[PDB]
Short mmCIF file of N, CA, C and O in Angstrom, two decimals:
data_model
loop_
_atom_site.label_atom_id
_atom_site.label_comp_id
_atom_site.label_asym_id
_atom_site.label_seq_id
_atom_site.Cartn_x
_atom_site.Cartn_y
_atom_site.Cartn_z
N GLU A 1 -5.25 -14.49 -5.43
CA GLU A 1 -5.01 -13.04 -5.60
C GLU A 1 -4.70 -12.63 -7.03
O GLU A 1 -4.40 -13.50 -7.86
N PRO A 2 -4.69 -11.36 -7.40
CA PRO A 2 -4.21 -11.12 -8.77
C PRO A 2 -2.69 -11.27 -8.74
O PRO A 2 -2.14 -11.19 -7.65
N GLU A 3 -2.06 -11.50 -9.89
CA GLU A 3 -0.60 -11.39 -9.88
C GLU A 3 -0.22 -9.93 -9.95
O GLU A 3 -0.90 -9.07 -10.53
N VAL A 4 0.91 -9.64 -9.31
CA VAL A 4 1.49 -8.33 -9.34
C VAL A 4 1.84 -7.94 -10.77
O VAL A 4 2.22 -8.83 -11.57
N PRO A 5 1.78 -6.65 -11.12
CA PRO A 5 1.22 -5.53 -10.34
C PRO A 5 -0.28 -5.46 -10.45
O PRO A 5 -0.93 -5.76 -11.47
N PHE A 6 -0.93 -5.01 -9.35
CA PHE A 6 -2.35 -4.82 -9.35
C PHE A 6 -2.74 -3.71 -8.40
O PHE A 6 -2.01 -3.38 -7.46
N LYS A 7 -3.89 -3.09 -8.67
CA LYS A 7 -4.38 -1.96 -7.84
C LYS A 7 -5.20 -2.42 -6.66
O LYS A 7 -6.03 -3.32 -6.75
N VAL A 8 -5.01 -1.68 -5.56
CA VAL A 8 -5.79 -1.79 -4.35
C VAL A 8 -6.20 -0.38 -3.92
O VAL A 8 -5.62 0.63 -4.34
N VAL A 9 -7.21 -0.30 -3.04
CA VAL A 9 -7.66 0.98 -2.50
C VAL A 9 -7.70 0.89 -0.99
O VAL A 9 -8.28 -0.04 -0.41
N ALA A 10 -7.03 1.81 -0.30
CA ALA A 10 -7.02 1.84 1.17
C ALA A 10 -8.41 2.02 1.72
O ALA A 10 -9.15 2.98 1.34
N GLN A 11 -8.81 1.14 2.62
CA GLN A 11 -10.09 1.20 3.35
C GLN A 11 -10.01 2.01 4.63
O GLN A 11 -11.02 2.55 5.08
N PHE A 12 -8.81 2.14 5.18
CA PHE A 12 -8.48 2.86 6.40
C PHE A 12 -7.11 3.47 6.21
O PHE A 12 -6.29 2.94 5.45
N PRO A 13 -6.82 4.57 6.90
CA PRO A 13 -5.47 5.12 6.83
C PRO A 13 -4.47 4.17 7.49
O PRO A 13 -4.81 3.55 8.50
N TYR A 14 -3.28 4.12 6.94
CA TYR A 14 -2.17 3.36 7.53
C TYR A 14 -1.02 4.32 7.78
O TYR A 14 -0.37 4.76 6.84
N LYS A 15 -0.86 4.74 9.03
CA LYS A 15 0.22 5.68 9.39
C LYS A 15 1.04 4.95 10.43
O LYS A 15 0.47 4.39 11.38
N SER A 16 2.33 4.93 10.32
CA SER A 16 3.19 4.21 11.25
C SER A 16 4.52 4.91 11.44
O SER A 16 4.85 5.84 10.69
N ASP A 17 5.32 4.42 12.40
CA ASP A 17 6.61 4.99 12.69
C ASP A 17 7.77 4.35 11.97
O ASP A 17 8.91 4.66 12.27
N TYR A 18 7.53 3.44 11.01
CA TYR A 18 8.57 2.60 10.42
C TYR A 18 9.01 3.08 9.05
O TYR A 18 8.20 3.34 8.16
N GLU A 19 10.32 3.26 8.91
CA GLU A 19 10.91 3.88 7.75
C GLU A 19 10.59 3.14 6.45
O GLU A 19 10.35 3.76 5.39
N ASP A 20 10.63 1.82 6.50
CA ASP A 20 10.42 1.07 5.26
C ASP A 20 8.95 0.88 4.92
O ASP A 20 8.59 0.36 3.87
N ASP A 21 8.05 1.37 5.81
CA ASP A 21 6.61 1.24 5.58
C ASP A 21 6.12 2.23 4.54
O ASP A 21 6.59 3.36 4.45
N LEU A 22 5.11 1.84 3.75
CA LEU A 22 4.31 2.81 2.99
C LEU A 22 3.17 3.27 3.93
O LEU A 22 2.56 2.45 4.56
N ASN A 23 2.99 4.59 3.96
CA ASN A 23 1.86 5.16 4.71
C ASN A 23 0.95 5.91 3.74
O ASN A 23 1.42 6.37 2.69
N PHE A 24 -0.31 6.05 4.13
CA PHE A 24 -1.33 6.57 3.23
C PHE A 24 -2.59 6.87 4.01
O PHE A 24 -2.82 6.39 5.11
N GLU A 25 -3.42 7.72 3.36
CA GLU A 25 -4.73 8.08 3.91
C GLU A 25 -5.79 7.12 3.35
O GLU A 25 -5.61 6.41 2.37
N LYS A 26 -6.94 7.13 4.01
CA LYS A 26 -8.11 6.45 3.52
C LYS A 26 -8.39 6.80 2.08
O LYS A 26 -8.24 7.98 1.71
N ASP A 27 -8.81 5.87 1.26
CA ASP A 27 -9.24 6.01 -0.12
C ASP A 27 -8.06 5.99 -1.12
O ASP A 27 -8.28 6.05 -2.31
N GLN A 28 -6.81 5.98 -0.66
CA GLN A 28 -5.65 6.07 -1.55
C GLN A 28 -5.61 4.84 -2.42
O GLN A 28 -5.66 3.70 -1.96
N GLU A 29 -5.47 5.04 -3.74
CA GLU A 29 -5.21 3.94 -4.67
C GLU A 29 -3.70 3.65 -4.69
O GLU A 29 -2.89 4.56 -4.82
N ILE A 30 -3.36 2.38 -4.62
CA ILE A 30 -1.97 1.94 -4.49
C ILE A 30 -1.73 0.83 -5.53
O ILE A 30 -2.61 -0.02 -5.74
N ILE A 31 -0.55 0.81 -6.12
CA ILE A 31 -0.14 -0.33 -6.98
C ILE A 31 0.67 -1.26 -6.12
O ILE A 31 1.77 -0.92 -5.63
N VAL A 32 0.20 -2.50 -5.94
CA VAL A 32 0.93 -3.57 -5.30
C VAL A 32 1.93 -4.12 -6.30
O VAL A 32 1.56 -4.57 -7.38
N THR A 33 3.23 -4.04 -5.94
CA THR A 33 4.31 -4.52 -6.80
C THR A 33 5.02 -5.75 -6.25
O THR A 33 5.78 -6.39 -7.01
N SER A 34 4.80 -6.14 -5.01
CA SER A 34 5.24 -7.43 -4.52
C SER A 34 4.34 -7.87 -3.41
O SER A 34 3.84 -7.07 -2.61
N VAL A 35 4.15 -9.15 -3.29
CA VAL A 35 3.48 -9.78 -2.17
C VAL A 35 4.55 -10.35 -1.26
O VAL A 35 5.26 -11.30 -1.67
N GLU A 36 4.77 -9.82 -0.06
CA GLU A 36 5.90 -10.17 0.79
C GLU A 36 5.61 -11.48 1.48
O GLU A 36 6.43 -12.39 1.51
N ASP A 37 4.43 -11.63 2.03
CA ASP A 37 3.99 -12.84 2.73
C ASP A 37 2.48 -12.76 2.89
O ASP A 37 1.82 -11.93 2.24
N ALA A 38 1.91 -13.58 3.76
CA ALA A 38 0.48 -13.64 3.87
C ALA A 38 -0.07 -12.32 4.42
O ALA A 38 -1.25 -12.10 4.20
N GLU A 39 0.77 -11.54 5.14
CA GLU A 39 0.25 -10.36 5.81
C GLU A 39 0.56 -9.06 5.09
O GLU A 39 -0.19 -8.09 5.30
N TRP A 40 1.66 -8.96 4.38
CA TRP A 40 2.20 -7.72 3.90
C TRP A 40 2.31 -7.66 2.36
O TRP A 40 2.82 -8.57 1.71
N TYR A 41 1.93 -6.49 1.83
CA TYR A 41 2.20 -6.09 0.47
C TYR A 41 3.35 -5.09 0.46
O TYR A 41 3.62 -4.39 1.46
N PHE A 42 4.03 -4.97 -0.68
CA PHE A 42 4.90 -3.85 -1.00
C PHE A 42 4.28 -3.16 -2.18
O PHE A 42 3.84 -3.79 -3.16
N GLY A 43 4.25 -1.83 -2.18
CA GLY A 43 3.72 -1.13 -3.32
C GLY A 43 3.98 0.36 -3.28
O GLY A 43 4.81 0.82 -2.48
N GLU A 44 3.28 1.09 -4.14
CA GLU A 44 3.62 2.44 -4.41
C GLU A 44 2.41 3.27 -4.78
O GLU A 44 1.37 2.75 -5.25
N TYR A 45 2.54 4.61 -4.65
CA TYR A 45 1.60 5.52 -5.24
C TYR A 45 2.32 6.85 -5.45
O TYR A 45 3.41 7.08 -4.86
N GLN A 46 1.76 7.68 -6.24
CA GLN A 46 2.28 9.02 -6.49
C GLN A 46 1.56 10.01 -5.61
O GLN A 46 0.31 10.10 -5.64
N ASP A 47 2.27 10.69 -4.75
CA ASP A 47 1.70 11.60 -3.76
C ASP A 47 1.34 12.93 -4.39
O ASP A 47 1.46 13.13 -5.61
N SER A 48 0.83 13.90 -3.64
CA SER A 48 0.35 15.07 -4.37
C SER A 48 1.51 15.88 -4.93
O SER A 48 1.26 16.66 -5.86
N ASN A 49 2.70 15.69 -4.34
CA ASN A 49 3.88 16.40 -4.79
C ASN A 49 4.38 15.87 -6.13
O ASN A 49 5.36 16.42 -6.63
N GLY A 50 3.79 14.79 -6.65
CA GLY A 50 4.18 14.08 -7.84
C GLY A 50 5.28 13.07 -7.62
O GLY A 50 5.80 12.53 -8.60
N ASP A 51 5.64 12.82 -6.39
CA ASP A 51 6.67 11.88 -6.08
C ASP A 51 6.12 10.49 -5.83
O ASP A 51 5.10 10.30 -5.15
N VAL A 52 6.78 9.47 -6.38
CA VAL A 52 6.41 8.11 -6.11
C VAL A 52 6.97 7.71 -4.75
O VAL A 52 8.17 7.85 -4.47
N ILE A 53 6.12 7.21 -3.92
CA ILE A 53 6.67 6.66 -2.67
C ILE A 53 6.19 5.23 -2.54
O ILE A 53 5.20 4.79 -3.12
N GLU A 54 7.04 4.46 -1.87
CA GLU A 54 6.96 3.02 -1.85
C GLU A 54 7.20 2.47 -0.48
O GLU A 54 7.85 3.11 0.37
N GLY A 55 6.76 1.25 -0.23
CA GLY A 55 7.07 0.55 1.00
C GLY A 55 6.07 -0.56 1.28
O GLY A 55 5.20 -0.87 0.46
N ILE A 56 6.20 -1.15 2.47
CA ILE A 56 5.40 -2.30 2.86
C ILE A 56 4.19 -1.80 3.66
O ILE A 56 4.21 -0.76 4.38
N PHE A 57 3.08 -2.54 3.60
CA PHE A 57 1.87 -2.18 4.33
C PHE A 57 1.01 -3.43 4.45
O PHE A 57 1.12 -4.38 3.67
N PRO A 58 0.10 -3.46 5.42
CA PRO A 58 -0.70 -4.69 5.63
C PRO A 58 -1.80 -4.82 4.57
O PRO A 58 -2.57 -3.89 4.31
N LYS A 59 -1.93 -6.05 4.03
CA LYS A 59 -3.03 -6.35 3.12
C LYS A 59 -4.37 -5.99 3.75
O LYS A 59 -5.31 -5.63 3.02
N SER A 60 -4.52 -6.16 5.04
CA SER A 60 -5.82 -5.98 5.70
C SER A 60 -6.32 -4.56 5.59
O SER A 60 -7.54 -4.36 5.79
N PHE A 61 -5.50 -3.56 5.30
CA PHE A 61 -5.92 -2.17 5.22
C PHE A 61 -6.49 -1.79 3.87
O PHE A 61 -6.95 -0.65 3.72
N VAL A 62 -6.40 -2.68 2.86
CA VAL A 62 -6.80 -2.35 1.52
C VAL A 62 -7.79 -3.38 0.96
O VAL A 62 -7.90 -4.50 1.45
N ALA A 63 -8.44 -3.02 -0.13
CA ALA A 63 -9.29 -3.92 -0.91
C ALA A 63 -8.81 -3.93 -2.37
O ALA A 63 -8.42 -2.87 -2.87
N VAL A 64 -8.86 -5.10 -2.97
CA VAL A 64 -8.56 -5.15 -4.42
C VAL A 64 -9.52 -4.26 -5.19
O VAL A 64 -10.72 -4.21 -4.94
N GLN A 65 -8.96 -3.52 -6.14
CA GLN A 65 -9.72 -2.58 -6.93
C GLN A 65 -10.54 -3.32 -8.00
O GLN A 65 -9.91 -4.13 -8.68
N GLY A 66 -11.81 -2.98 -8.05
CA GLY A 66 -12.96 -3.55 -8.69
C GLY A 66 -12.53 -4.95 -9.17
O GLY A 66 -12.37 -5.86 -8.34
#
C-alpha cells in the first residue's frame, strides 16, 4: 500500500449509524491518515461546509487515487 497519508476515492457511498465512522458519497476524495487493520482505514475530507470530518471506513469502498 502507499504509506500514510495518501489519497483514495470512494467507489460507492458509505453511510452508517456509527459515530466514529467516516461517511461519504460516491466519488468523494479522502485522505487516509491511518491504516487501522486489514479491513479499515481512518481518514478525512473537507465537506461542503468547509469542515474537516474524520473517522474509520472500509478499505473495500475506496480505490487508491491514480
